Curated annotation (Swiss-Prot), chain A:
The lineage of its organism: Archaea, Methanobacteriati, Methanobacteriota, Thermococci, Thermococcales. Part of the 50S ribosomal subunit. GO terms for biological process: translation. Pfam families: Ribosomal_L21e (PF01157). PROSITE patterns: RIBOSOMAL_L21E. One of its GO terms (cellular component) is ribosome. The keyword Ribonucleoprotein applies. This is Large ribosomal subunit protein eL21. GO terms for molecular function: structural constituent of ribosome. Residues 1-23 have a biased composition (Basic residues). It comes from the Archaea. Residues 1-24 are annotated as: Disordered. It comes from Pyrococcus furiosus (strain ATCC 43587 / DSM 3638 / JCM 8422 / Vc1). The gene is rpl21e. InterPro entries: Ribosomal_eL21, Ribosomal_eL21_arc, Ribosomal_eL21_CS, Ribosomal_eL21_sf, Translation_prot_SH3-like_sf.
From Swiss-Prot, chain B:
It holds the Pfam family Ribosomal_L16. One of its GO terms (biological process) is translation. Belongs to the universal ribosomal protein uL16 family. It comes from Pyrococcus furiosus (strain ATCC 43587 / DSM 3638 / JCM 8422 / Vc1). HAMAP family: Ribosomal_uL16_arch. GO terms for cellular component: ribonucleoprotein complex; ribosome. The keyword Cell membrane does not apply. PROSITE patterns: RIBOSOMAL_L10E (PS01257). Part of the 50S ribosomal subunit. This is Large ribosomal subunit protein uL16.
RNA sequence: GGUACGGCGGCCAUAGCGGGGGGGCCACACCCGGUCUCAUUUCGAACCCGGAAGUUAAGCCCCCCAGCGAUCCCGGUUGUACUGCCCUCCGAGAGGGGGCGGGAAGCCGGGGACGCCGCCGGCCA
RNA sequence: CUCAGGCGGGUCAGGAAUCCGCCGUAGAGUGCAAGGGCAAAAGCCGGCCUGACUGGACCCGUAACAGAGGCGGGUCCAGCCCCGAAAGGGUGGCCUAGCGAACCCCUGUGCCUCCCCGGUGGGGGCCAGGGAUGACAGAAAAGCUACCCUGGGGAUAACAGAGUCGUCUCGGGCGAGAGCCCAUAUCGACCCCGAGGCUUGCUACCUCGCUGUCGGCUCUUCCCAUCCUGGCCCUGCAGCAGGGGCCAAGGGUGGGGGUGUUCACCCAUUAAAGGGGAACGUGAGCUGGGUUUAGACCGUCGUGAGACAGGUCGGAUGCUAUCUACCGGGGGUGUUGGCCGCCUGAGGGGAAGGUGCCCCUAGUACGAGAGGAACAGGGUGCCGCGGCCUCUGGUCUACCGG
RNA sequence: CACAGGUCCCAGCUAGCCCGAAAGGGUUUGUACUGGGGCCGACGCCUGCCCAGUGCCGGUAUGUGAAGCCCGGGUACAACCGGGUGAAGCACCGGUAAACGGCGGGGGUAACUAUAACCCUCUUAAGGUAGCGAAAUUCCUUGUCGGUUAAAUGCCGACCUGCAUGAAUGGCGUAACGAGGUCCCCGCUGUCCCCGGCCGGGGCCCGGCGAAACCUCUGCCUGGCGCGCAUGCCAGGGACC
RNA sequence: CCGACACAGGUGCCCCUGGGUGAGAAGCCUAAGGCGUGUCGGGGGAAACCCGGCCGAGGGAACUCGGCAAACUGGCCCCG
RNA sequence: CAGUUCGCUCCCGUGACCCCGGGCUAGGGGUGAAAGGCCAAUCGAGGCCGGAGAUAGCUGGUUCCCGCCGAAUCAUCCCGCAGGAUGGCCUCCCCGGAGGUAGGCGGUGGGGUAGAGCACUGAUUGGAGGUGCAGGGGGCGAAAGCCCCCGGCCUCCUGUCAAACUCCGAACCCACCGCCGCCGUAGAUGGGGGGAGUAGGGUGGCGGUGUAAGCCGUCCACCGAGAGGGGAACAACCCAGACCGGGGUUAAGGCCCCAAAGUGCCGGCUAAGUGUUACUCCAAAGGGUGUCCCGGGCCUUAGACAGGUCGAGGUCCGGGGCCCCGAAAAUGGACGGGGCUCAAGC
RNA sequence: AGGGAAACCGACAUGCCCGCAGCCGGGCUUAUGCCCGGUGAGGGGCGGGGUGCGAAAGCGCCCGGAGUCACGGCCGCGAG
RNA sequence: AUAGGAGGGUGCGGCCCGAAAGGAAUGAGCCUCCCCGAAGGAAACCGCGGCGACGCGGGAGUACGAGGGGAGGGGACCGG
């Protein structure tokens, strides 16, 4: 039986937190800041449901090209297409 | 009863979750300890498989009855402890097939089996020195009922392999 | 610069749970009393307001431990289980094997671990 | 503010009504499946509210890479607001389901427009919301065909072949036992390992510009897992017989009743009246009883046309042999010149033989008795094969007679 | 299939039924002992119950019911909106089964054994009456019993458990009749045991006329590979034309 | 004449029939009339086999789906 | 002889009988003692010409040569499933002008598969301790309740599990950055335009499913669309990817003959023609003082075993190599064949 | 000269940056050639402008002149 | 008239034809001798290693080697 892709399809383990990490995350990731041109990894925080990108892009590394409101604008290369995502800084991690 | 060669091999994934398997049958073997477990015994004879294999509950029960009868006749109830270390968890199913063949062929449960790795103990008989031959004969009788090559080993209380010492002595 | 003083924090158990001993210049508390501010789906029990008669019993501060939990290092199991690539290698089959590259989990033994760090203020000097 | 559950203590009050204390990482709850997330909350209890609003931009998913109508979601700007001391939050439900093109119609709102011009009634257009297509990327919509027709398909069933062996047929390993003792004279539970392709099934690999079905008759050949005939072993084998097994495929394995039957059942004989393969051998050899068209009847089902792997009566079998194959009959060349006659036998073929009964051994061996053999020696029947016409019978379109 | 016979339906004539676009017409130079339309099918004895359903016929108090007409609103006139009247047809009521069809299902008994319907409970419009029944209808089935044979998946007689018989889509019986299906008996015979002779015409040879179907080229086997049954491929065997 | 034919069909057997046997316009023989043109001839123990016909000892349906085919009987007179 | 005839047999043969000449009924029509029969060899809707060269997603066919490049049967939608459309993959031309990334090393991050384990969720054998715990069974008491057994619930020990479990956790894969390597100004990455074909795939490894064959996906290696040299012939297996004429050396593999190359060498095994098989084809459970070896115990050279006497190794066990039994099929026959035994087998 | 359903309204003959080819100056190189710096048509990006929706911001389309005709070829659609 | 494969492919031999259009008496097939030479590449013999098949150093990158040139003899074929 074919199943169409949805936001939470096959995310039982991808979007699950460690038992010892249950609860609110430390505020450093919430309040972290980035500059245009910086490269950041995408690590979705399951507890925060705002500004979450599609889980298909979890684990990828993109580049910051702007900032709208509280969310950062991240550009990724899916195959040959350029895809633009609006990701909250809590879901991002600096490279190196 | 279909031939055991069908379920002998372990190429299929584990099928044990009773929460999701519909119509799983109840076990046919309910006794796993016989004799005098409390009493101590100098020697223990264990039976191992030479290859991974699924042993059916019917074969397990047949071996249990044969070995228990032999040990009761020859050794005595208070002079031995016979234990089967494995439990049948794998659920064996069969394609239910006027009549449609190969259409919706997922099988319905028909039996149970125990899946064993290589060199895994199946059963143990704990006896003293004077009943070692009877224990070995019981182990051979049990092995005659299983669908795989099996071998016996003798261990002391500490767990060291002393089969050659005992048989030579 | 000293202090068994406090406030705001970072990592978020190697930091937790449970035990033993010591301490109060200051400071933090327990504590005393409910007119006023505030509240009980009753209760000044909490919260709030007004204070210093008494206490270091405990919250707190300092030192220690290894019973539980967690976790770092070393040795054994062990280059064991598993695995990427190639193969005119064996095997009736199941599967295994040779060469090159990786490599556990659990268990046993011996150590570690009863947190580390940032900004500032109070008191004394 | 902290839940579920548990422990200890309490008037009725008990397992369970309400209350005090302690342990209590969520073992509760969050509207509804499951997964994920939630503990000074996203749970429970209260206060105040309607941001479940208006005008727009960009981006992700359905639909990766890699195209998309419709739909869902995320990040924001502005307007008017809500809660809060403030920070901050609010574009429905903590996240992932609960839904839908064109055309047409209804409603809201405030603009444009209708053929020379102006007014009125009416119509058309732009924006927003709604009425549904579940076959859910959106036709309005019941059946028979055996009187059937066309284009095709081994992309796809029935017969047959192929693969497989679950099933079928036939074995093997161990030995609980049953056999007066004794597992193995015989039967052998529960389990386990196989062989064959002789039953059925499964797959759909060859064959739909046709490979003619079941049964029977005729004819040829092969296998052994041997029914009889030949020779043996064990026995719970006294004899006569039985039970089990081994070698052995030369020969035999027949006649009849019902039934289309194969098979199965039955009858009288017999040494026995074996199982199978050869395109379920054999329709350019036969027959056509069954099956499977077109006609018709009965029963059941259907409103009906009609249908039934339900019965029943009738219902077509084409051939001048091209090649090869086998059976017999001839002409040639070669065999180091031609011809006549008599021989040799390398190889091939055979079943040229097979099998009953009777006399005697002998009422003997054996056996309590009943009963009852064998070696050797004689006779003869049947089946099979190769010949012949003296005898018998048939024919005798020569001939003779009525 | 038809048939004589039985029975049902419509119609008093400008009828009933039918052809046609119409005009006209067939039945009809006819008139209920007639014309037209179904079903059964000689003859003998009979033809039971059911009108809830689907049809047909009669009624239609009452509801709905199109156009037209009327009334009010609207439109300087209309389109448009509301109401009243409202035939047929449906709704409703009654007849009709030789109209289409239907005619069920559980417990226990009368134990002078056991087993039967007298019997009491749901249930419909009613629950299959007389007959016939293993049937051209019976799946189990080659039902069971009796006769026929040495032997009977046949045939005949009987029982009833009628999967799924039945009374004009007729039930049962029936003399005579039949190139209909079916079983048996006497007689007869080459159907057979078991085949053997004879005759005429072909076949065969000689002299003549003189084609067609069909044809990739070819054309020996065993075991194999192969689109899974090869004269042609591989390894072997054999073979003068 | 029609059927593509000097076609064993159909149209047309549409109308008519001496003697004997015999109920008979039956079968058989024969007179009249017609023909040897229902048009390829010759050979032969010259086979096997096929088509058409005759006979078959003993048995008498044992054959077969099924007495298929063949065979038995047969006209007339008198009893019944 | 005949696009329905001939022979034998059979049926009616005064009647609803057979035949002839003249007429009428014409195609959704006629006629029918009803078979869907008959209507000029045609009838479940006649024939002739016309619409008309009708239509089909279905079958067949499509005509000269060389040169260059060279696929696909995978996703979404369709009354869509033998057919189409949008993409993916191919090819041709042009613009633009400096980067690009199939391979590797190091780094920054992500993951929960294999394995493993019981710390949640659910299974799972026995024992010990605690708890009267709303259970049941007895004894026991007027009645308030006791005494045991069993059962339930916790802790520990013991023996086992999970595709829809995870306190742990690889190999490996992916995203990004620097470098090595390679490609690119003889113009890459990228962009625009023209033309397609492809919507049946197969073998092979892996995963789910199934007794198996097979069915369904996945990996892109080979056939499809691929020559040459081999496996006896073979689509897929091995070497190998190919313009033309010559010379040489190697690859797969092979060297007794067929058949080019050794009856080649050293050590050991097999006595069954086992074998002579890399794979497309190849029989097991259970047994063997059959042989060649390894390891471990008891006695152990006149103190062992076999039958107080002899007078040198025996006793047992667990394993390894080859071989043997288990082992029956149909036309006559298959190591490719001949044949091969200190091999021409292993 | 485009925007809009319509009424209707109504735009850069270059303000700025980057920059290939070409040109200019310099260095190395036997030469080709390479490198550095300017200028740079075409090309790319800003800024500004017309109009539609909007209270506005802001977005869509358009704006700094290349089209038209002919011959030949490939393809799509309709006709057999 | 003792031999097996879709009727063909590579090479040559036997028999036969061979005037012209192809070469050729300005010399053909053929015979003898000399020079250079890519990739490749021996052996006699001597010394040594190995149980052996055999190998290693010299001989030696020698003899030979696709092809590229020259000279002499003979006198009619070669290609097809």
């Amino acid at each position: 039986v074919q199943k169409a892709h949805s936001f939470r399809r096959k995310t039982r383990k991808k979007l699950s937190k460690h038992p010892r990490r249950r609860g609110l995350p430390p505020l450093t990731r919430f309040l972290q800041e980035f500059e245009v041109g910086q490269r950041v990894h995408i690590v979705i925080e399951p507890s925060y449901h705002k500004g979450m990108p599609d889980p298909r892009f979890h684990g990828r590394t993109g580049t910051v090209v702007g900032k709208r409101g509280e969310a950062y604008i991240v550009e990724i290369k899916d195959g040959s297409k350029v895809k633009t995502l609006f990701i909250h800084p809590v879901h991002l991690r600096p490279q190196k | 009863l279909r031939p055991a060669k069908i379920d002998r091999y372990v190429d299929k994934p584990a099928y044990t979750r009773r929460e999701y398997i519909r119509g799983a049958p109840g076990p046919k073997i309910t006794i796993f300890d016989m004799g005098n477990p409390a009493g101590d015994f100098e020697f223990e004879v264990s039976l191992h498989t030479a290859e991974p294999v699924q042993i059916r509950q019917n074969a397990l029960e047949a071996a249990r009855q044969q070995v228990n009868r032999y040990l009761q006749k020859n050794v005595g109830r208070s002079n031995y402890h016979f234990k089967i270390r494995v439990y049948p968890f794998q659920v064996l199913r069969e394609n239910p097939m006027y009549g449609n063949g190969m259409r919706r062929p997922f099988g319905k449960p028909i039996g149970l089996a125990a899946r064993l790795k290589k060199d895994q103990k199946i059963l143990s008989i704990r006896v003293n020195r004077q009943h070692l031959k009877f224990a070995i004969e019981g182990a051979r009788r049990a092995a005659m009922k299983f669908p795989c090559k099996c071998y016996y080993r003798i261990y002391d209380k500490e767990g060291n392999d002393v089969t050659t010492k005992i048989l030579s002595q």
